[PDB]
Design an enzyme around this catalytic site. Structure first.
Site, PDB file in Angstrom:
ATOM      1  N   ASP A  66      -2.592   1.786   1.751  1.00 47.79           N
ATOM      2  CA  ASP A  66      -2.931   3.205   1.569  1.00 47.79           C
ATOM      3  C   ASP A  66      -1.612   4.007   1.640  1.00 47.79           C
ATOM      4  O   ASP A  66      -0.556   3.425   1.934  1.00 47.79           O
ATOM      5  CB  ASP A  66      -4.031   3.675   2.557  1.00 47.79           C
ATOM      6  N   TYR A  68       1.445   6.835   2.603  1.00 46.21           N
ATOM      7  CA  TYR A  68       2.139   7.213   3.805  1.00 46.21           C
ATOM      8  C   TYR A  68       1.408   8.416   4.412  1.00 46.21           C
ATOM      9  O   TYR A  68       1.176   9.406   3.733  1.00 46.21           O
ATOM     10  CB  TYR A  68       3.583   7.581   3.489  1.00 46.21           C
ATOM     11  N   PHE A  79       4.955   2.617  -1.753  1.00 47.18           N
ATOM     12  CA  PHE A  79       6.223   2.522  -1.027  1.00 47.18           C
ATOM     13  C   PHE A  79       7.218   3.642  -1.286  1.00 47.18           C
ATOM     14  O   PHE A  79       8.053   3.924  -0.436  1.00 47.18           O
ATOM     15  CB  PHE A  79       6.884   1.164  -1.285  1.00 47.18           C
ATOM     16  N   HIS A 189       5.454  -8.906   5.125  1.00 51.55           N
ATOM     17  CA  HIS A 189       5.601  -7.508   4.761  1.00 51.55           C
ATOM     18  C   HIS A 189       6.980  -7.024   5.150  1.00 51.55           C
ATOM     19  O   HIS A 189       7.495  -7.417   6.181  1.00 51.55           O
ATOM     20  CB  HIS A 189       4.514  -6.648   5.423  1.00 51.55           C
TER      21      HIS A 189
END
Lengths: 225, 82
Positions: A66, A68, A79, A189
Site C-alpha cells: 500500500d 506511504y 516506492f 524486502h
C-alpha cells in the site's frame, strides 16, 4: 469519473475491462470515505496514475504494498516519493544503494521514480490508497482484485515481462504470472530489517535487463540522478 | 502518533516513513523470535546518529508493539523485545 476508458491509458482499458465494476466501486468507497469525514492519502489524481503509462510498453513490474502513509509522500507509484521529500524512505534508500552497487551510476538526486515509470517499469502497489498515518488501512478493501487483474493481464500479453518481487507479500503473486513469457525474480524486502538478508547483492536492475534481453526485448534505462 | 512509542523507548522525535508488512517466517530469522502472525516494520530514520529505527507491530487494525530494533551505520542491531 466513471467509465474505464476515461480513467486509464486504454489498452489498460482492455486489461482492466473485467474489473470495471470492481474499480468503479472503489470510487464510491473513496467518496464514501471522504463523506464519513476521513481522507485517503494517495491523492485523487494519482491513485490510478500507475495505469496512465502504456500497457503494451511495460517490460518490468515492481510490485509494492500500500502507499506511504505520510502526507505528501505517496505519489501514485510503488516506492517512489515526491522530489521535495527530504529524508527519504529507508526502503528506498536501500533500493538505491543496490542500484548504485548494481549499475555504475551515482546516487539519485531524489526519490522521484517518475522516469522509470515512463520508460516501461510499472510501479504498481497492490493496494492503491490508504488512510493517512494508518498503514494497511485499505487492505482487503477491494483494491487487490484490481491490482491482481492488472498483473494477470500483463502476463497474458505476447510481450515478455520481468516481475521483481520484494518481500514475501509480493511472492504470493508468483503463481499469478504463469511463467510462460514472464520471469519473476524474488528477494527479501529492501526494508532495513531484511535488506542485508538477501536483497543486497540480488542485482535486480541489471538482472531484470539481461532477462529482458534474453527474451528479445529492450532493457530498461533506470538511471535518474 | 504510533511514533510516540518510539519516542518513549528511545527519546527521539522521528517520523515513521514506511510500514512494510512481512510474514513471521521473514521476521524470525533476523530477530530470532518467531512472532504469532504477520508483522509491520515501521521504519523511521534518525538523521543525526545515522540509525534506522524500527518498530515492529501486529497487522493493520490493532498496531500492537512487538519488538524494537535500532540499526547502525554498520548493520548491527540492538534488538529490544517489547
Amino acid at each position: 469519473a466513471r467509465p474505464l476508458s476515461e480513467l486509464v491509458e486504454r489498452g489498460w482499458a482492455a486489461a482492466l475491462e473485467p474489473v470495471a465494476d470492481q474499480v468503479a466501486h472503489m470510487g464510491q468507497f473513496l467518496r464514501a470515505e471522504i463523506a464519513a469525514g476521513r481522507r485517503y492519502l494517495p491523492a485523487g489524481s494519482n491513485v490510478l496514475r500507475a495505469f496512465t503509462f502504456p500497457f503494451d510498453n511495460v517490460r518490468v513490474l515492481i510490485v509494492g504494498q500500500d502507499p506511504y502513509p505520510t502526507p505528501g509522500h505517496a505519489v501514485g507509484l510503488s516506492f517512489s516519493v515526491a522530489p521535495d521529500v527530504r529524508p527519504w524512505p529507508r526502503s528506498l534508500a536501500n533500493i538505491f544503494d543496490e542500484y548504485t552497487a548494481d549499475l555504475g551510476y551515482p546516487l539519485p538526486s531524489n526519490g522521484d521514480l517518475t522516469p522509470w515509470a515512463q520508460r516501461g517499469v510499472l510501479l504498481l502497489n497492490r493496494v492503491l490508497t490508504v488512510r493517512p498515518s494508518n498503514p494497511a488501512s485499505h487492505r482487503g478493501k477491494g483494491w487487490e482484485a484490481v491490482t491482481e487483474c492488472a498483473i494477470r493481464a500483463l502476463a497474458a500479453r505476447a510481450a515478455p515481462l520481468v516481475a521483481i518481487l520484494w518481500g514475501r507479500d509480493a511472492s504470493t503473486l508468483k503463481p499469478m504470472l504463469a511463467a510462460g513469457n514472464c520471469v519473476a525474480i524474488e528477494s527479501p524486502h529492501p526494508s532495513p530489517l531484511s535488506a542485508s538478508r538477501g536483497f543486497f547483492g540480488s542485482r535486480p536492475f541489471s538482472r531484470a535487463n539481461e532477462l529482458l534481453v534474453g527474451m528479445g526485448a529492450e532493457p530498461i534505462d533506470w538511471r535518474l540522478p | 502518533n504510533l511514533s510516540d512509542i518510539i519516542e518513549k523507548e528511545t527519546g527521539k522525535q522521528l517520523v515513521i516513513q514506511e510500514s512494510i508488512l512481512m510474514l513471521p517466517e521473514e521476521v524470525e530469522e533476523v530477530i530470532g523470535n518467531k512472532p504469532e502472525s504477520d508483522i509491520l516494520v515501521h521504519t523511521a530514520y534518525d538523521e543525526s546518529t545515522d540509525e534506522n529505527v524500527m518498530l515492529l507491530t501486529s497487522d493493520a487494525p490493532e498496531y500492537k508493539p512487538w519488538a524494537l530494533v535500532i540499526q547502525d551505520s554498520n548493520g548491527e542491531n540492538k534488538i529490544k523485545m517489547l
